[PDB]
Ligand binder design. Structure first.
Ligand SMILES: Nc1ccn([C@@H]2O[C@H](COP(=O)(O)OP(=O)(O)O)[C@@H](O)[C@H]2O)c(=O)n1
Ligand SMILES: Nc1ccn([C@@H]2O[C@H](COP(=O)(O)OP(=O)(O)O)[C@@H](O)[C@H]2O)c(=O)n1
Length: 223
């Protein structure tokens, strides 16, 4: 039985999770926010050790023994729901150093594919390496982006303590690290549909991804 798979990759604050949530809702699909898994590992390390040093033996051992569950995008660490902590500024400041570690990417890889394999209708998975690593044979691979300035302005309007320039710098730095790291970097491929949504609403972006999906669905079904 065929399960549909939509991959949504893109840089920081491009709208991937909110767009993917709406796409999934309109298609009757589930939605996995893969970055919550990296954020949860980051939070676990911060809380346990204070400093995040994922190459240290003690921290690596902690991560490997950690039981991570995700249910409706709530993430549990050894049974405890840590979802309300995943967007804390301290997690933001350290999640790149966690995500660069091969052994952590391997741990999270298995978790994501277990979620994907349980889906019986379709799933939208957002992240950085969904099209290149997690769902390399996704029916539709979307690379969702906008200018750094557009994305920083969006995040700025959400409120918070950072200035616009601080957000812009943080976004550019995180994007640069995600693009240049050794393992599973953020990259568009020739099989991606690149959507620049600077001049689009959230609903327009979701409706464009749905249009693209229906076009590949009809194409694939008959060819
Ligand atoms: N066309 C759009 C798309 C998203 N947004 C907003 O931009 C913010 C970033 O969205 P997000 O958290 O889903 O983005 P990601 O970091 O998950 O890619 C949210 O507050 C969205 O509602 C917008 O203002 N205009
Ligand atoms: N599939 C993924 C998802 C997230 N990540 C890492 O986790 C960080 C946070 O991802 P996110 O999706 O929660 O964050 P935003 O896109 O909202 O900035 C990214 O900047 C990457 O370092 C990754 O490496 N691979």
């Amino acid at each position: 039985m065929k399960t549909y798979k939509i991959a949504v990759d893109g840089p920081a604050a491009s709208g991937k999770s909110s767009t993917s949530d709406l796409v999934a809702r309109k298609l009757g699909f589930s939605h996995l926010i893969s970055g919550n898994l990296y954020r949860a590992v980051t939070y676990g390390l911060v809380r346990r050790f204070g400093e995040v040093r994922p190459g240290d033996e003690e921290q690596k051992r902690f991560v490997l023994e950690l039981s991570i569950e995700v249910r409706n995008n709530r993430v549990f660490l050894d049974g405890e729901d840590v979802s309300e902590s995943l967007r804390k500024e301290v997690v933001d400041r350290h999640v790149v150093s966690v995500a660069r570690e091969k052994y952590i990417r391997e741990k999270v890889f298995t978790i994501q594919r277990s979620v994907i394999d349980l889906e019986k209708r379709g799933i939208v998975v957002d992240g950085r390496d969904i099209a290149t690593r997690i769902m390399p044979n996704a029916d539709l691979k979307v690379f969702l982006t906008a200018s750094p300035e557009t994305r920083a302005r969006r995040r700025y309007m959400e409120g918070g303590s950072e200035s616009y320039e601080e957000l812009l710098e943080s976004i550019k730095k995180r994007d640069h690290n995600d693009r240049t790291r050794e393992h599973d970097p953020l990259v568009a491929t020739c099989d991606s549909i690149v959507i620049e949504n600077d001049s689009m609403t959230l609903e327009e972006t979701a409706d464009e991804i749905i249009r693209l999906f229906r076009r590949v669905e009809s194409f694939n079904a008959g060819h």
